[PDB]
Design a protein around this ligand. Structure first.
Ligand SMILES: NC(=O)c1ccc[n+]([C@@H]2O[C@H](COP(=O)([O-])OP(=O)(O)OC[C@H]3O[C@@H](n4cnc5c(N)ncnc54)[C@H](O)[C@@H]3O)[C@@H](O)[C@H]2O)c1
Ligand SMILES: NC(=O)c1ccc[n+]([C@@H]2O[C@H](COP(=O)([O-])OP(=O)(O)OC[C@H]3O[C@@H](n4cnc5c(N)ncnc54)[C@H](O)[C@@H]3O)[C@@H](O)[C@H]2O)c1
Ligand SMILES: NC(=O)c1ccc[n+]([C@@H]2O[C@H](COP(=O)([O-])OP(=O)(O)OC[C@H]3O[C@@H](n4cnc5c(N)ncnc54)[C@H](O)[C@@H]3O)[C@@H](O)[C@H]2O)c1
Ligand SMILES: NC(=O)c1ccc[n+]([C@@H]2O[C@H](COP(=O)([O-])OP(=O)(O)OC[C@H]3O[C@@H](n4cnc5c(N)ncnc54)[C@H](O)[C@@H]3O)[C@@H](O)[C@H]2O)c1
Ligand SMILES: *C(=O)[C@H](O)COP(=O)(O)O
Ligand SMILES: *C(=O)[C@H](O)COP(=O)(O)O
Ligand SMILES: *C(=O)[C@H](O)COP(=O)(O)O
Ligand SMILES: *C(=O)[C@H](O)COP(=O)(O)O
Lengths: 334, 334, 334, 334
């Protein structure tokens, strides 16, 4: 397996770690955060959203011990001091949320890693990948700093791919009704985004999203054809994309759902899923797919305007994609 | 002026009562529910959403006393037994949520009332009205069982009117991210709507919105041109409509927002409002308008697809409209 | 082994059903509620608190099919019409919340069952049992309508037993900070308890606890020595008892905790548990014990006043006790 | 009258500012935080808990303008750089949460202020005051760095004073069921307190409190006689103290409530209030008193063990007390 290091052992870092435990291709050997092993161990064992960790965790000296394997714990605020190379770490998952610009993410490379996966939309990255959509575009020689995009983009892109390929998207707009995250605030505090400054668990909070425009990074044909926003709400995990699009081909609900179902069971199995059950957000807590079509919500007007709704566990699905992307990158040679 | 009776002194019944206290053209003289005066008085005084009633409330026998005015309290499950005529009640607000079918609502008329306003989409009603949109259609001789539509329809219809008149709507789809209501469930209990059966405060819950297609009742030109859904979320009040529409005329964001702002300050003042502030749902708690455009959220693609977002206090705005409709009906003669 | 019927397939009914699937001495063969099989199947499959049912569920006609076993579905509002005897049901779990009075619960016996377990404090029941505390008081010949007490009493009685036996309780008072339940209201609606009338997910709500005084039913020596209250809060499951008691013997924190830990590992293992971890309510979601001491919270003043805090999953722990009680009753002969 | 500066314009800082608008003895002339005027103005204008500020707010340069009065906005992380003296600020309310140790709070004095009120329990402070309890212990010459204690201590101390004086407290233990605060975490993140690290809006979270022991600072007679804890829950504001105490004198519920009511209507009017209404936390949102006895919850066992429950708006009541303490200090001479 490829040795992985996780920088920022938080909601995404720990979920990636948990996903990695059940992946034979990658091995997490070290984590970095801003605290001590005791604290990281406690957070890893008991999760308010995902429950008790299905593993034995303990602390040995300054390190974590998980299922008998020692995981080195670092506490370096500056990634340049990480010394990844010294411990054979080849891939670093950059999940602090502070180092989304290449010049920052690349510090892991200076520290000895060979690749960095930024767990968020990035700036100046070598390439942005959405698994199931454009991983074939990854180039092992040219791309060292790779963004895995956002959880919303990972939800929308796979079914946008399907709609576009099968019926052609003329233009479309989305809204994601999205669980709150740690980028928000408990009770009205300063934030660059005056909406995200407001009490997260008390309101429906509109916030801008680059997700629909970011679909263009992975589906160039859709450049300038999409836009949308988010509405953060008082749930702690699980989100849902609501896309309204104008199509080129005339369609029925049955045809749209049938195409989506086909892709889910075929080419996009494990990435896109399809449900005809009348479910609610809690039901998708722990879902590892990127996107699950809520088939009951599909509607069409004039055979040209379609609404497609798709669920995603914003922490889990995206983290499993990070793990898939790391395994994929390792498979192309390091 | 006009004597009003409120059947179902709940979220809408009590909010209507509060709105009526401000209206000199109406007088609420009686309320009916399924409990005693002491309980209704306690509920009216202390509200979890709206705070403490700014008025003196007490109980005298089987009646409420509000600012020295006695309000008769009835506890008749069957509206046939209401004897509204005996106490001079001319207009009954039917807000129990159980009597939206004319067969049931009309019992108030048999019991002596002259008019009934159903506080929800109805079946077999004489007419459905949205203030600011089609009150002109009301006929005092022909219409005695009148629906005030839904809170979502009251939010959407006023700005849909504007968009259609100014640019023409080809087709459009909406989603309302909506606060939970008493039609939902605390913890997974049977419900005819399997989504609404689920714990209200724990999930994002896709479900129905009365606004889907009902806008056509008040804007016939939009028949078959709109559809949509709701997403019930863990907030106790305030909701927001998100409409994505294809327009006939080419527009810019500036033009859409300018038309909306013009209507808000003009023809639709008091019904439609316009905000350029980056607010959140809690900020609209207590808002009496039907619809407030969140101008910052307006977006356009190809000058033809537009997204317009509008806030509404689902309890307050709608209840103030019920009061406006009652005063309007009274003004055309009883 | 023993055929069981569940009357009221709700939070407790379904949780009991899940617990029974693990017990080989029990077989649930029928459930009754107020809806159709399709609805009960959907509720059993997807739970907002406990997640997806770890079993295969389908519907065949008017029945549920769970792991290939058919479970009969009834929809009889009046228990007299249940005909339990016709299907060989020996033990009925009465979990509707409506039939806690013997006059009502006993109808199941008239309908052919041999025993009824009321899932709540009861009136005129033959006996009230708390497993681990007084099951030996059960008499197979004399007792046919049995109450399993409340979830709070099941939490408090086991450790009160320990404290009293080891140090002697002079008097004590409790408060349970308790998750909201279906007996509450979504948004301010009439309730005989004016506090429980108020929006459940919006407030800390003082109210009643069945555990106040009921511990005396199972620990007669404590008659008149305890009292207390509940504080319902905005969490959907998991509660915590906070007991402050004056003891007869002088003690230290260490001694109290040591006795509690001893009982947990000994005589009360599986009923009472002991934790030295700094956990929070979500961590106990799914806990099957009746009571888990939060050892870190133990404190003493003057060697005589002690505070003991204990967690309980109010749905799960209690439901597992209902199953234990059913197996116990069956073991003494039907 | 006295010019005040607020360091840390957050939940307490802004609430203090609002309370000061209603006080003729002090004038807030400057505020310091870590952001720009535009952000502080937006936060002051729209509050998720307390609603819209009923005042005209605007920004002029780097300052706030409230009802035409300019409030200077600073953004100095290090209080040494505050230059309070230059603007005539005599009293600084230290509400950042970072400077509770005298050595840090005293930096405001080095910067030119004459007095500092730390809005929290402090270390090495000159004196700790609870209004209504020991303000007469304040010495204008000797005490420059003063703590206003915690919100919980402000709730408990006033009624503990009454119980002790009237009946004598032998010993007692408290739990405050308390709204979450900004010291907590949105989704499981590192925190020195492993319970406070956990998702604030998802659980009941036990946490240690120095509040009951801190009562001794203001009621020396109660040294070593009290202790207790907190349970943080998913409400955004309002908390409740639950005290269980052994008394010296034999009492009845009636007598305890009568003494509490007497103190509320007499010596402690404005500080301690008394309610016989069955209210819930939301009803106390905006309450300016320090403590409101929930008279219905009072209970006694053996005439010696009493439970007294008291409400408090943890943001508002405490902030009004800060303002009272600032006016009091100004009244003794600066
Ligand atoms: N939460 C989600 O749904 C989600 C989904 C997809 C992607 N993302 C992205 O993933 C990233 C992290 O998100 P999160 O939700 O896990 O955040 P988080 O705040 O929960 O975790 C961040 C972690 O990084 C640590 N940290 C912060 N700065 C550090 C630094 N200088 N060096 C070492 N450790 C540091 C923190 O202590 C914390 O444990 C962000 O870029 C976010 O946009 C989040
Ligand atoms: N809550 C909202 O956002 C909202 C907005 C607009 C319209 N509406 C509609 O208004 C109606 C009332 O909604 P609500 O949210 O106020 O519901 P609610 O449940 O809060 O209140 C209805 C009230 O009617 C009483 N009631 C029930 N059956 C009755 C009967 N047989 N006789 C007399 N009283 C009876 C109840 O005791 C309760 O106080 C529903 O039709 C609803 O769709 C709701
Ligand atoms: N939820 C808890 O924490 C808890 C814990 C211990 C005990 N209890 C007790 O158990 C009982 C059930 O509580 P719950 O929380 O599961 O309630 P619930 O409302 O969730 O479920 C009760 C179920 O009974 C059904 N029902 C109602 N009346 C019926 C009737 N006439 N015939 C057949 N079915 C009927 C409902 O449809 C529902 O499915 C109550 O006595 C409660 O006090 C509750
Ligand atoms: N929230 C409550 O119920 C409550 C009640 C009583 C006392 N307190 C105490 O008051 C204090 C503040 O609590 P809060 O809830 O208002 O906190 P908060 O986090 O909401 O606000 C603190 C404010 O201080 C600012 N700040 C942080 N560091 C600063 C610095 N170095 N210089 C200037 N500004 C800085 C922040 O940006 C924020 O606006 C803490 O000591 C707290 O314990 C809180
Ligand atoms: C997912 O990556 C994150 O939690 C939410 O942000 P979006 O930009 O909506 O994906
Ligand atoms: C408003 O009337 C109700 O709360 C919401 O339902 P819609 O059907 O979305 O109006
Ligand atoms: C448990 O049986 C129920 O949920 C809570 O009520 P208590 O009476 O506090 O047990
Ligand atoms: C009040 O000061 C703060 O919000 C809560 O902490 P306590 O220590 O309970 O006062």
């Amino acid at each position: 397996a490829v040795k992985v290091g996780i920088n920022g052992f938080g909601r995404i870092g720990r979920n990636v770690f948990r996903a990695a435990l059940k992946n034979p291709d990658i091995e997490v050997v070290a984590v970095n955060d801003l605290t001590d092993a005791n604290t990281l161990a406690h957070l890893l064992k008991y999760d308010s959203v995902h429950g008790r960790l299905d593993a034995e965790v303990s602390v040995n000296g300054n390190n974590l011990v998980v299922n008998g394997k020692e995981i080195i714990v670092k506490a370096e605020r500056d990634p340049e001091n990480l010394a990844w190379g010294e411990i054979g770490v080849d891939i670093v998952v950059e999940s602090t949320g502070r180092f989304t610009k290449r010049e920052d993410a690349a510090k892991h490379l200076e520290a000895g890693a060979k690749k960095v996966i930024i767990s968020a939309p990035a700036k100046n990255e070598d390439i942005t990948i959405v698994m199931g959509v454009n991983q074939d575009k990854y180039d092992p020689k040219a791309h060292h700093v790779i963004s895995n995009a956002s959880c919303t983009t990972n939800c929308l892109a796979p079914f946008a791919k399907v709609l576009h390929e099968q019926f052609g998207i003329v233009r479309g707009m989305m809204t994601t009704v999205h669980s709150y995250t740690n980028d928000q605030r408990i009770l009205d505090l300063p934030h660059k985004d005056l909406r995200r400054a407001r009490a997260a668990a008390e309101s429906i909070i509109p916030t801008t999203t680059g997700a629909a425009k970011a679909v263009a990074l992975v589906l160039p044909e859709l450049k300038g054809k999409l836009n949308g926003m988010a509405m953060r709400v008082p749930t702690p995990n699980v989100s849902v994309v609501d896309l309204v699009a104008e199509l080129e081909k005339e369609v029925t609900v049955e045809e749209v759902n049938a195409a989506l179902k086909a892709a889910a069971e075929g080419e996009l199995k494990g990435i896109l899923a399809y449900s005809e059950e009348p479910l609610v957000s809690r039901d998708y807590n722990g879902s590892t797919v990127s996107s699950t079509i809520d088939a009951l919500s599909t509607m069409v007007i004039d055979g040209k305007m379609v609404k497609v709704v798709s669920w995603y566990d914003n922490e889990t699905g995206y983290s499993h994609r990070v793990v898939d992307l790391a395994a994929y990158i390792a498979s192309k040679g390091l």
